[PDB]
Amino acid sequence: MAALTRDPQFQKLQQWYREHRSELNLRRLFDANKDRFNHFSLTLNTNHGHILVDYSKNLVTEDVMRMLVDLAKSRGVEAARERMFNGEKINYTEGRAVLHVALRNRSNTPILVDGKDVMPEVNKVLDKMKSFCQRVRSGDWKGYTGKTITDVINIGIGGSDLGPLMVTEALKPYSSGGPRVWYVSNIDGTHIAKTLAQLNPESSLFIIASKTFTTQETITNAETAKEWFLQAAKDPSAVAKHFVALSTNTTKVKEFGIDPQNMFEFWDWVGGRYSLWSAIGLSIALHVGFDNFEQLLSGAHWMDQHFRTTPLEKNAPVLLALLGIWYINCFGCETHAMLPYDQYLHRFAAYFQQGDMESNGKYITKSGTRVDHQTGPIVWGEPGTNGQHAFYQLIHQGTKMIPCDFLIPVQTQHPIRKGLHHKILLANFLAQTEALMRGKSTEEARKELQAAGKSPEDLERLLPHKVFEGNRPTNSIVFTKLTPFMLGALVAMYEHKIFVQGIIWDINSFDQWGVELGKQLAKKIEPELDGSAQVTSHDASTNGLINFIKQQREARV
Amino acid sequence: MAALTRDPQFQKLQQWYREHRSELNLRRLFDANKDRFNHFSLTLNTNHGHILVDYSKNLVTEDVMRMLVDLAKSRGVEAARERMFNGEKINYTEGRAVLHVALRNRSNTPILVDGKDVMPEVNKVLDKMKSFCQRVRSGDWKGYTGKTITDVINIGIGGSDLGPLMVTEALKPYSSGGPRVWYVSNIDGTHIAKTLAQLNPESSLFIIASKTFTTQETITNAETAKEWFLQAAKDPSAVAKHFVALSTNTTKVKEFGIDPQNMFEFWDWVGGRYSLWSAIGLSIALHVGFDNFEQLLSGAHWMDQHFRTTPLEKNAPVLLALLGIWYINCFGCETHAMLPYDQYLHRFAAYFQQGDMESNGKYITKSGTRVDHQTGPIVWGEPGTNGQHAFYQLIHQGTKMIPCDFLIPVQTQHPIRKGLHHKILLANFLAQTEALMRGKSTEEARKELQAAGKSPEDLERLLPHKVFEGNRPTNSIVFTKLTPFMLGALVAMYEHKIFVQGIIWDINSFDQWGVELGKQLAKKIEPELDGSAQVTSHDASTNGLINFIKQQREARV
């Protein structure tokens, strides 16, 4: 018995579900309540765009929502939220604060950790980022042969990669006048090799993103880039004009050949998967400009404030979190699909696979007892309409219930053909959730087939295949335009959803002990791959795979 | 009750699982059987590289595998296979044959549909492709100002896009002397606009992929490309040097301005999600050359024969399918992760999201009866080590069982740093499945904590969070090298896996009636978006969303 399962509000939810779930049908709910949209949607005015969070096409009633809010209160969500914002060490397995909200604290209200306001250091780094971006983008910063920088290459793994990549992809229209950005993350040599082949050492700037500056994959990639660079430049002192670090390890950064005045710091209370708001976002600021980076921070700051000051029943991240709890812990849905109808957001779902799954893919509660319920879902998705033409067949007519978040900006960055493309995109965004909710009954389908002139035999044969059961729930999140500020707000909104869910489950959303074993076992296997000897030190499978690898690496195909 | 649930072998499988589920622990299974890898792995020599399908880190015993194979026999897998290969109309809801295997039938052994051999038509199109490719690649084919083609842009959705994109990405090293390739699929105007912004109309060749040549999204994109082209070229007759078609609609192709000689045909027995082997693969052949395209076809042909002649108990696609049935229909796993440790294969999982999910995300059986069991799983993943640093926390320490296919080539296309990068990649590939299988016990973690000098209190506090329960099953698929031939073999293997699961579930893997409703509803919404008038013709949510869109159209942000 974990905290969640012992909670009385949760038990009430489970009981309601057992006795009413058979009665949850979206067509009937909408048919019976013309005010349903008004009662189950939230409109936020950020002053830089509106966000409509329409959660009306969910398998919930007023009572369900009331009970879910009651659960949030019973589980101490608000108090936990205050602990985070106040700089308390809520990352309890690692004794650390959790302060990505400090990174984007534009108001500069003091946030104390161990007796010291963190804002001065947050702002010192931001100031350094701003100066650097101005120098690089303006052409002031010269390469070793006196040329301007045309390409910036971020080298990092996990949280040092996904955020910056997703945001620069999403904000590509705001990069006029910025250098090209490249992301190298995989230790797979293909990644760095194929990137370097397209670059000029005289005009490329590498950004090595690693807090410790000892991260294996990242430093290997970094060392490979340096070797390539020196092959052309020869002079070790030239490295300082072409490599900067996002790290705190001054000695290692200096030893690499980077001038430490170009080491951009961040802190223990910045989790990698919450780090794009820090120095880690340097490649974003370089690409779209520091002004745009500040707008991104400001958007997140707005949402932070929304989350902090809004009554639970009208609090966007809380409601999203609660809906997820309902589908995960009552309906048992393993996954959560994120489907932005926006090609610029093509890596948004991939970003939340880390942000969500690495945060809440957990099983030990704060008290040390194992959970006896589900925790975080498997997050997945492709942007519409691409995903729509790949896997929606399964969403509409498969055997899995799959909560989906559909997202779209009202205004497109590319209003080509007098808005025709965006009109079709919007129509599909709307129709898909409508279809998922409504379905098509046997009766309706039969009438279509008859109207189509199908013979009775053909009709009876095809009929069942044309039926859509519907009742498939979705959220529709519509926002004015995907600007830097609005993206900031949207990302922060999901960060706080994830936080609320973790508090409810009583897990630690901010550690990641689950990455350790794989790292340990890889270090053991590395040296064993060298040479031609048979390996017999592991289970038979691991041995067998290693031995096949040894046999085949000498094969001439 | 559906076919599967009525099947005596399936019931036998279920009884066994009910009786012995808790007898399935990988760590113990491997400790008890030193020959486990040997008994639960396949080695395939294709003459152009080996494939090791190591399915030993799965929750199975010899009895379980026997029962699974017996299930495949009972469900008539072999007879269904022969029907496919013999050109019978196994796509029963549409009354069509399913002959992607004919597209790569290098043997040219006759395959008849309605008494007529399809190979001549297949080969005629292939010869056409070969000639066109030679002309474009050699510089013989020139644009409207006499320049050679430097860029090829494929415009299509779903199956007309994903396969060609995935394969050209995977085979990038083999594209020397080929034009760059671009893929435009999203109706979102950003996709075509950001693509066209980087192109010169004088040296760009557009490939319009659509059987009917009336596909709304594809044709909208195509017309946008043509308008951009003509803004530069002016002369309508120049469209014929810059646009070709993958279609059978001669009339519409001619009307578009394409020379009918440059219409590359395919057939109703080529499913879109099985079409890269046909004319739909033209961009592949253009990028990496027709010879490399033939090698891709040849690899698939090799795997088709393996699937055809190998006893079920040692038949790769069959075993992969059967393991999936075990996890889906007995263990209840909703998902299947595909994790290639290969950056070139970064779009492999996405491809199989359509291939698998659009095929088997079904709920009506051959007899018209609704299934009463699960069908296709939710397929997802990212390449290692990228995904490894994103979401593996949840795979190791979350509350979901997630069957994972780990894939990797022994030989890298980029053996930089004297093989150091690939060494580290392989070590992680190996360590991850080893870790997932083995886990780390309370006692093992305790010993580590003591050794690190943790106080008893600190130790007891952290201990449970450091435990890995393990027993997480995986397949490891290792192949000599990712050449065009090997990629063909791999994709075909998965195609047949999907086919086998579909036969077992008694669903139609080859239709997609699930896409109709959304299309119908979108068509109704399009004209409603025009104008300022409030919409009230739908459910309250759909109306509300539309009205918010109309409102926010007018906002300046």
The enclosing domain of A547 has a CATH number of 1.10.1390.10
The encoded tokens of residue B278 equal 């046909």
In this structure, are B371 and B482 located in the same domain?
Answer: yes
A202 reaches B (C-beta below 8 A): no
The rounded distance, in Å, linking the Cα atoms of B142 and B157 is: 27
Provide the chain A residues 154-183 that lie in CB contact (below 8 A) with chain B: 157-159, 161-162, 172
- DSSP secondary structure code for residue B158 in this structure: G
With tokens 């609704």, the residue in question is B370
- CA–CA separation, B26 and B464 (whole Å): 21
Domain end point (choices B264, B294, B324): B294
Q: Is B402 on the interface with A (CB under 8 A)?
A: yes
Single-letter residue type at A252: K
Angle between helices B119-138 and B290-309 (to 10 degrees): 150
* Eight-state DSSP code of residue B144: T
A358 is in an annotated binding site: yes
Known binding residue A212? Answer is: yes
Whether residue A119 sits in one domain with residue A12: no
Angle between helix A540-552 and helix A516-529 axes, rounded to 10 deg: 40
Angstrom distance (rounded) from CA A498 to CA A327? 14
Say if the Cβ atoms of B363 and A469 lie within 8 Å: yes
- Annotated binding-site residue? A159: yes
Among partner residues B465, B529, B545, which is closest to A478 by beta-carbon distance? B545
Q: Are B474 and B405 in contact (CB under 8 A)?
A: yes
**Strands of B176-301, DSSP E:** 180-184, 204-209, 243-246
Asked whether A481 and A50 are in contact (CB, 8 A), the reply is: no
Task: Assess B341–A contact: CB distance below 8 Å, yes or no.
Answer: yes
- CA–CA separation, A347 and A386 (whole Å): 13
Catalytic residue among B358, B362, B382, B422: B358
| DSSP symbols for B454-486 | --HHHHHHHGGGG-B-----EEEEEEEE--HHH
Q: How many angstroms separate the CA atoms of A522 and A41, rounded?
A: 48
Pick from A155, A424, A236, A180: nearest CA to B527: A424
Which helix (H) or strand (E) covers residue B409, if one does?
strand B404-411
Scanning every residue of chain A, which has its alpha carbon at the shortest distance from the alpha carbon of B223?
A: A417
Residue of A93, A172, A391 lying closest to B354 (CB–CB): A391
Contact partners, residue B30, CB within 8 Å, separation at least 6: A539, A540, A541, B36, B56, B437
How much is the CA Rg of chain B, to the nearest whole Å? 26
Chain A residues with beta carbon closer than 8 angstroms to that of B525: 426-427, 430-431, 434
Closest CA to A376 of A400, A398, A357: A357
B519 is catalytic: yes
| Annotation says B389 is catalytic | yes
Task: Indicate whether A255 and A345 sit together in one domain.
Answer: no
Q: Rounded to the nearest 10 degrees, what angle do helices A77-85 and A484-505 cross at?
A: 120
How many Cβ contacts (< 8 angstroms) between chains A and B? 528
Out of A378, A393, A525, closest to residue B430 by CB: A525
Spatial CB neighbours of A287, under 8 Å, sequence gap ≥ 6: A152, A168, A171, A175, A178, A179, A181
The residues, ordered by sequence, that sit 6+ positions from A407 with a Cβ below 8 Å of its Cβ are A338, A339, A340, A341, A342, A345, A348, A476, A477, A478, A479, A490
Q: For chain A, how many helices (H) and strands (E)?
A: 23, 13
CB contact under 8 A, A414 and B354: no
Do you find a cis peptide bond into A310, omega within 30 degrees of 0?
A: no
Residue B146 has a CB neighbour count (10 Å cut-off) of: 8
Answer whether B353's CB lies under 8 Å from B380's CB: yes
Distance CA A446, CA A36 (A): 30
B522-527 contact pairs (CB < 8 A, 24+): B522/A424, B522/A427, B522/A428, B522/A430, B522/A431, B522/A432, B523/A427, B524/A431, B525/A426, B525/A427, B525/A430, B525/A431, B525/A434, B526/A423, B526/A424, B526/A427
Contact assignment for B540 to A56 by CB distance below 8 Å: yes
Residue B59 corresponds to which tokens in the numbers above?
């929750």
> Rounded CA gap, B10 and B68, in Å?
8
Given A278, A294, A310, the domain boundary residue is: A294
Is the same domain home to A396 and A421?
yes
**For residue B119, which amino acid is it?**
M
* A281 within 8 A of A262, measured Cβ to Cβ: no
Q: Which residues pair with A364 in a beta bridge?
A: A370
Report the alpha-carbon distance of residue B291 to residue A273 in Å, rounded.
44
CATH number at residue B205: 3.40.50.10490
Amino acid at A461: R
Print the domain residue range for A216.
100-294
Would you give the DSSP letter of residue A371?
P
3-state secondary structure of A25: coil
Catalytic residue IDs of A = 358, 389, 519
**Burial class of residue A33, CB neighbours in 10 A (0-12, 13-18, 19+):** middle
Helix boundaries (H) for A506-539: 516-529
- Which residue does chain B place closest to A421, by CA atoms? B189
Q: Are strands B41-45 and B50-54 parallel, antiparallel or unpaired?
A: antiparallel
d(CA A459, CA A448): 10
Q: Find the helix packing angle between A62-74 and A77-85, rounded to 10°.
A: 50
Q: Is the CB of A143 inside 8 Å of chain B's CB atoms?
A: no
8-state DSSP, A147 = P
Token readout for A355 is: 């942000």
Residue A18 CB: number of other CB atoms within 10 A?
10
Gap between the Cα atoms of B123 and B127, Å rounded: 6
**Resolution in A, one decimal?**
1.9
Q: Are residues B459 and B361 in the same domain?
A: yes
Q: How many domains does chain B have?
A: 3
B452 touches chain A (CB under 8 A): no
d(CA B32, CA B30): 5
Could you tell me if B352 and B494 are in contact, meaning their C-beta atoms sit under 8 angstroms apart? yes
Task: Classify residue B194 as exposed, middle or buried by CB count within 10 Å of its CB (0-12, 13-18, 19+).
Answer: middle
Of the candidates B419, B409, B174, the residue with the CA atom closest to the CA atom of residue A189: B419
Alpha helices in A316-441 (DSSP H): 316-325, 348-360, 392-397, 420-438
- Enumerate residues 6+ apart whose C-beta is below 8 A from A462: A449, A454, B93
Are residues A295 and A488 in contact, defined by beta-carbon separation less than 8 angstroms? yes
C-beta separation of A120 from A109 below 8 A = no
Let me know whether A500 and A547 are in one domain.
Answer: no
Instruction: Determine whether the interchain pair B368/A461 forms a contact, defined as Cβ–Cβ distance below 8 Å.
Output: yes
Q: In this structure, what token pair is assigned to residue A147?
A: 């040329």
Q: Are A207 and A279 in contact (CB under 8 A)?
A: no
> How distant, in Å, are the alpha carbons of A95, A373, B104 from that of A92?
5, 21, 58
Bridge partners of residue A481, in order along the sequence: A411
Are residues B171 and B44 part of one domain? no
Specify the pairing of strand A41-45 against strand A50-54: antiparallel
The verdict on A310 and A440 lying in the same domain is yes
Is residue B385 a contact partner of residue A421, using CB atoms and an 8 Å limit? no
Q: Residues 306-325, chain B: which have Cβ within 8 Å of A? A: none
Q: How far apart (Å, rounded) are the C-alpha atoms in residues A484 and A174? A: 8
B263 is written with which tokens? 């219409």
Give Cβ neighbours of residue A502 (< 8 Å, ≥ 6 apart): A359, A360, A362, A508, A509
Given the residues B389, B400, B414, B447, select the one marked as catalytic: B389
Q: Give yes or no for a contact between A433 and A406, defined as CB atoms under 8 angstroms apart.
A: yes
| Strand, helix or coil for residue A506 | coil
A54: contact with B, CB 8 A cutoff: yes
- Among the residues of B364-483, which ranges form H helices? 392-397, 420-438, 442-451, 456-462
Whether the upstream peptide bond of residue A385 has omega within 30° of 0, thus cis, is: yes
Dihedral of the alpha carbons of B41, B44, B50, B55, in degrees to the nearest 10: -20
Q: Within a 10 A sphere around the Cβ of B291, how many other Cβ atoms?
A: 12
Residue of A56, A335, A361 with shortest CB distance to B378: A335
Interface of A with B in 348-387 (CB under 8 A): 350, 353-354, 357-358, 360-364, 368-371, 373-376, 378-380, 382-386
**C-alpha–C-alpha distance, residues A332 and B105, integer Å:** 45
Contact criterion met (CB below 8 Å) for B360 and B497: no
CB contact under 8 A, B414 and A194: yes
Chain A residues touching residue B43 (CB < 8 angstroms): 548
Distance CA B63, CA A317 (A): 49
Q: Are strands A335-340 and A263-264 parallel, antiparallel or unpaired?
A: unpaired
Q: Is residue B4 a contact partner of residue B505, using CB atoms and an 8 Å limit? A: yes
User: From start to end of A7-130, where are the E strands?
Assistant: 41-45, 50-54, 112-113, 116-117
Rounded to the nearest 10°, the torsion over CA B491, B495, B496, B498 is 130
A309 and A375 in a single domain? The answer is yes
Q: Could you tell me the CA-to-CA distances from B467 to A505, B153, B246 in Å, in that order?
A: 19, 51, 55
Task: Provide the 3-class DSSP secondary structure of residue A315.
Answer: coil
B273 touches B354 (CB < 8 A): yes
Cβ contact B271:B135 at 8 Å: no
Which residues between 508 and 547 in chain B have a beta carbon less than 8 angstroms from any beta carbon of chain A? 508, 511-526, 529-530, 538-546
B191 touches chain A (CB under 8 A): yes
Between CA B265 and CA B240 the distance in angstroms is: 17
Q: Is the dihedral of CA B120, B123, B129, B132 positive or negative?
A: negative
Alpha-carbon span B299 to B490, nearest angstrom: 8
**Could you give the CA distance from residue A223 to residue A204 in angstroms, rounded to a whole number?**
15
B493 in the same domain as B353: yes
**Which tokens belong to A9?**
């509000």
A 243-302: CB under 8 A from B: none
- A301 and A273 in a common domain: no
CA distance A285 to A302: 19
d(CA B347, CA B170): 8
- Of the three residues B269, B294, B319, the one that is the final residue of a domain is B294
A134/A281 same-domain check = yes
Nearest chain B CA: its distance from A66 CA (Å): 20
Q: How far is CA B517 from the centre of its chain?
A: 24
B418 and A CB contact within 8 Å: no
Tell the residue number behind the tokens 């939340």, with chain if given: A352
